[PDB]
Point group: C3
Chain length 273, copies 3
């Protein structure tokens, strides 16, 4: 009277101590067990459970099932291991909305607030919005970087020439030895193994050594150098060249010749008295 049930099928059987069970062919064998509809079984004494649907099945201790051919699949789980979740978890029971051969979408759900709340598809999308933002940021950086590698790579291929041969297109030196050394104040040192030891000096050439204030050394005591292709000095502080000296040598030879003849004439007189 307020609980109608159209049927010509067999009796309901609420077998368990303190149990409830409604519907045709409904075998509730478990203590304090609920089950509702066409052959909703409460398997093994397996206690306190619930199955609410056509051919429903409560199989695990302290669990629930819901609907068509639904079954409890593991129930209470203790010291168990959840996905995305180091540290173990505890559970007081399962809640099935389906089966191992068949599952169910859980519609119309408000976005979780506290930690143990079902989270919906929207609350995920929000995360996945960032992953996306991030993934893009990465493609940029792989890109940006692949370029920096190229730029840096060129510097090593266009300057590398300069840092290794210590040379430029107009100040070249074919050598691989000791670094030039400009050791005195305002000194210049050109070429491997050169040394400008003195105030305001220049050491010009491989293993040149300038060891005296205000000089330009074209070599050393262990190895001098001739200077070549030098135009005749004109001013007082210009360098003289060999052709210039040659001129003087020439006048000296002319003199000696004159003195010879003079000596002859003086003999030619002395004796001709």
């Amino acid at each position: 009277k307020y609980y109608h049930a159209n049927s010509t099928e067999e009796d309901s059987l609420a077998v368990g101590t303190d149990s409830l069970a409604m519907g045709a062919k409904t075998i509730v064998n478990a203590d304090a067990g609920i089950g509702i509809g066409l052959n909703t079984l409460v398997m093994a004494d397996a206690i306190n459970g619930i199955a609410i649907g056509s051919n429903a099945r409560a199989n695990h201790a302290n669990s629930i099932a819901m609907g068509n051919g639904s079954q409890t699949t593991r129930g209470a789980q203790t010291d168990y291991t959840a996905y995305n979740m180091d540290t173990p978890q505890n559970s007081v029971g399962e809640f099935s909305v389906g089966s191992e051969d068949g599952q169910r979408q859980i519609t119309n759900v408000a976005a979780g607030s506290a930690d143990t709340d079902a989270v919906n598809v929207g609350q995920l999308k929000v995360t996945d919005a960032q992953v996306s933002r991030n993934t893009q940021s990465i493609t940029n950086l792989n890109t940006q970087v692949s370029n920096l590698d190229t730029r840096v790579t060129n510097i090593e291929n266009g300057i590398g020439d300069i840092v290794t041969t210590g040379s430029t297109k107009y100040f070249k030196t074919n050598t691989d030895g000791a670094d030039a050394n400009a050791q005195g104040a305002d000194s210049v040192a050109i070429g491997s193994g050169s040394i400008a030891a003195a105030e305001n000096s220049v050491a010009l050439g491989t293993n040149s050594v300038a060891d005296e204030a205000n000089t330009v050394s074209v070599g050393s005591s262990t190895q001098q150098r001739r200077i070549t292709n030098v135009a005749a000095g004109v001013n007082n502080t210009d360098a003289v060249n060999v052709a210039q000296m040659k001129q003087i040598e020439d006048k000296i030879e002319e003199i000696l010749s004159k003195i010879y003849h003079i000596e002859n004439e003086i003999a030619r007189i002395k004796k001709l008295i």
Copy 2:
């Protein structure tokens, strides 16, 4: 007798074949259908369904609803794109906890373990912990990268100056001709078109050619150079200057003068016999 129901409202109607239905105004029209409470409708023969609440509504085949003005919204769904997946998903049914214009939070839920388990707000937080870690990693690299670009920029804007001008603040050459050439071992070549062909040599100046072991060439056969601002040599292996030579020229002129007078005196005698 153990199933009380306070009411003066109309009858329950468990209409469907094999169906159960309890509560006032509860119209269960569907076969093997359950529905419980104030006008909980099982719409269209739409089968095997369930609605458990005030004005509840089971509308889709094989589905469930729960609570105030709740409705099944799509039910079983075959080969359907599920969020985030890739391959199609199958579903035996829906389970509504609400409606299109009203939804419900699902509290007190143990963290999912297997793939088809509801995941809670905690299991998401764990993911979002990493997104955060990652996002920060990005901001760093963005920053670190930009810092490198600025660095590479400065190299590219300091080192270029050289690579084009072949010149540095302290070694300069106003020019745009042939790269200098240091072709001999340990040789030095300064300035466009210079050539240091010989062992241990220097070619000092535009189009200078030093073609002899142990020399410094200040030009070539096609164009020599004067060397200027040269102090008087003191040591044997110092370069002499013109004023120095001028001294010697001066003594020679004094000699010639003497020889003239001597010649006169010798004539002045010869003839005065």
Copy 3:
């Protein structure tokens, strides 16, 4: 008759207006309230609520609970900040599957499709597959970058030391002064304060000034320089050294001596007539 309930416990009490309530010791105090099984309450002010299980508990307005010692924990919550949302959220009710002290895994669930669908552990795994992919990409870029910094520190620690010093391993100059200046066409200027003012000229040395076409200046009017370590000239356009000159000075001194003796002999004759 189709609703059996094995028990010797007290009566069910469907107290609330329009309410339903089945099972032993079941106190349904709330209007339009459902509750099913042993000792299940609907007290507090649990308007329209539901509890379906052993010792079940509907405590919050418009809410639901399900199973063993289950309780409604907050119910309808409006304009609450739920995890990850920024926007506030509305809710028509809670759905508990457990307790503040004890919770439940929700097995056998089809992957959510629309926004308000429970999402399963699988749908998360898909996300977390990318986070992983991304995290790896980061570790790479942190690496790739740590390299580039290395490579770039090096260039700075090689080249730019040039741009600061004006010096390469083989063209050094120990100086802070005025840049070099190569002002004439095809001119060369070496060292701080040097000036190559003239066509095709070289200014060799700190504050050297070459102000005449086709010259190499080793200094200036304000400060000249000796040139050292210079081999004896051989060719006409080679520079002469001092030892070369000393030889000529020596012959001149020999000549003057001769002329002295000649002069004496000439006097020795003149007067000896």
